Subunit: 251 residues, 4 copies
């Protein structure tokens, strides 16, 4: 298995859940990976659970930390060579309607979910363009980038923003022949440690009126579409949306 | 003509261009209107050009000014009674790719285009719900909420955010029987004083590969869809996107 | 004050429900209207229920009847002058999954819902182009043109076809400066006497997991968006989709 | 290492271009494949160009031939065992505006592009449901299923129909726990020997206002997204649209 031969990936929020599975399958397919997270013990443990430092490393980083992004790229390049792949997966969710959202909650969520993805996409383009790397930026943009949820106001705003901002970046890279693709991935409900904690969460998500398959997905479901998008298999795919959601948005 | 009989509207950025035309046709159809802008002389002149203070007034307000939103609603209610209609039209545009966007430009544009629309939508729901007003929030969300533009990175992010955040608000209002609808309007290229200033802007916009009709629209084109959405004619329309773009997004 | 001054409209399936209301409000706004249906007694009574023969008439016509379309335009023009507006509203529904759809059912439904809309759109462009009529073709394309329904296989096919075929027509008309616009309207669930017939239908449709507003719409809800689209108010709107569905597609 | 271990696929229109590449990579990933086409000499040579008769065979079949579909499944099953994967790729194009489309052209194109996909999807569900095969129906639905083209009226109709009919099928299969997924793939412009035939076609397609990448794709670009969709890697993806188009629909 070598579908990501030679690739060097940054996966933000890669110590848990979806990000962890992305990192796992990236390494499996021959990529070198740096995962980020805010907790060192958890993060170091996550990295070692996947492989040795010759294929994967942890870097403590908050995606909303702009200066940290430059340090992150430098560290990754020093370890593994020129970055080829950026997965902007770090994010948080707040369960508040637009009406009930505090401005504090609004700004906090958008600093991670929107500013963080902007920082990673902007730097990704600057650092990876014109190097013949088959570079790929994969922005995590949710079913909440397509359809509203009354309890996810700020989250909806952030994911809609990521969805269309990514199209802008894809077009600019394509028109300028940067050899950088930008696409968005839109998970439906996926079983994560965060979902498991919230009592009744999986039950709500598994209703047929929400997810037609009647159950939520697993992190590997998102990892494999990310492998496709990071690989040269998808070299004609840019500015597009890839939805893996058990049928949620089809009805 | 009385399609907006009894309505009381706040139109942000209503002293110029699209916002001015919205205000104009709202008053024509029997609504009372408060328009906002950052310049008093321009704003007072704009208001008087449409009518007397018995139907329209100007309030100096920056849509990114959170505290000012509460003052704005209070002022409007004191003048004309309970607000029924909020048009979140204030916005700016920056001509930068994602790659070339400074963090300063990013934050400035989003403070107006995204935070401003959030502030108006959130307060709109709080102040207008459960009053049997046939309340309507109309968020201006652009063709740039649908398709990317390589030179409009931050603008794309803001308009994608507005697009989906508005769906969240619409759903919450519908599910809680608030008697508040929320919809988005998506203008294509429209002739405004801002477009006229930028040499070559209308020419670029009028190319058939951009706008199939081969010319840009006029502010009244957006005013009339806003009249429909503010009126009780559209009482079953919520969470939807209304595109007036000369065919831009159809190809 | 009339919003459809001078317009001459054909409304197919205009003797009942949504089509009847479209015809009704068209006449109210000053249009001359020919409504079609397959049943003469019902149809003649329907026309007279709206207005006199100087503003509305019934013509017996099956929208799947290609030769009848030329006859229909000729009859309408002889009565009221050059046609300016075509509302392709005739349609049928079959409650079958794709799996369970007979080829007979498939062909029957598509003959009306797809072929009929093609016949009306094709002839509409031919008959109305270059005459400076502010011509507008309004194709009825359903929430089922956006999202699937497991029990509406053939219907979904027909409405997806109408949705995108209409964009093709809109673009060709725009690029050729034909003075013809083409748009689609997408009703959610609407209360008609026919819906009243099917026991439990309205209750099912009004569930919040279907329609967030918790009730279904009325035919006038679709009539008023059609008035907008038929009027010169919408002269910059073409190739677009107008959804009136109580929030159905927003979640 | 094989990603399609145990799969048995029917690929219609599989003797040339996109279909040929899909068949080629399916066989590479361990699937047994039957390709169809209307020309025996071309088709038999095509099958042998990919592999031996133990992994790929040609069957002469017109996708609009309803009775032939049952024969096709029987033949495939006799050769390779129960079918697990159906790629509805057979199709034709007509370069006519809606206005200029003859009824003969309309019916001919829809008989293959729409009826053929219906026949294959309907029979696929009937033949593959409840067998625990990880079954996948992949319907080829084009960028022309998303956006209009003034010169592709009938084609647009057919591809819009396929787009939404496929969601209906996906939902029914999901809700009934059929172990069948249905998704659509949307190629942009792809270089084939047939495109090479039409002088100036590739140049037109490669204009930045059409394809932002400034070049068209290759059949393998569509093959690899189909491998993903056919594989159990995509077991949570259903009712979704996968666009591989060099940025065409992003602007
Ligand atoms: Mg009347
Ligand atoms: Mg939905
Ligand atoms: Mg091979
Ligand atoms: Mg486009």
């Amino acid at each position: 298995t070598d579908r990501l031969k030679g690739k060097v990936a940054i996966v933000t929020g890669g110590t848990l859940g979806i990000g962890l599975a992305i990192a796992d399958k990236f390494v499996e397919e021959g990529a070198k990976v740096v995962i980020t997270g805010r907790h060192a013990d958890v993060g170091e443990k996550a990295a070692k659970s996947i492989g040795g430092t010759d294929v994967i490393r942890f870097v403590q980083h908050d995606a909303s930390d702009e200066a940290g992004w430059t340090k992150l790229f430098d560290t990754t390049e020093e370890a593994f060579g020129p970055v080829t792949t950026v997965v902007n997966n770090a994010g948080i969710a707040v369960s508040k309607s637009v009406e009930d959202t505090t401005t504090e909650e609004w700004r906090k969520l958008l600093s991670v979910n929107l500013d963080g993805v902007f920082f990673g996409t902007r730097l990704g383009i600057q650092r990876m363009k014109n190097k013949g790397l088959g570079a790929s930026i994969i922005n995590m943009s949710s079913i909440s980038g397509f359809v509203g949820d009354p309890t996810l106001g700020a989250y909806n705003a952030s994911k809609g923003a990521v969805r269309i901002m990514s199209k802008s970046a894809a077009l600019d890279c394509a028109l300028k022949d940067y050899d950088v693709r930008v696409n968005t991935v839109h998970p439906g409900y996926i079983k994560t440690p965060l979902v498991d904690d919230l009592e009744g969460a999986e039950e709500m998500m598994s209703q047929r009126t929400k997810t037609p398959m009647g159950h939520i997905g697993e992190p590997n479901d998102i990892a494999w579409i990310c492998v496709y998008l990071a690989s040269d298999e998808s070299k004609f795919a840019t500015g597009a949306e890839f939805v893996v959601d058990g049928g949620y948005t089809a009805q």
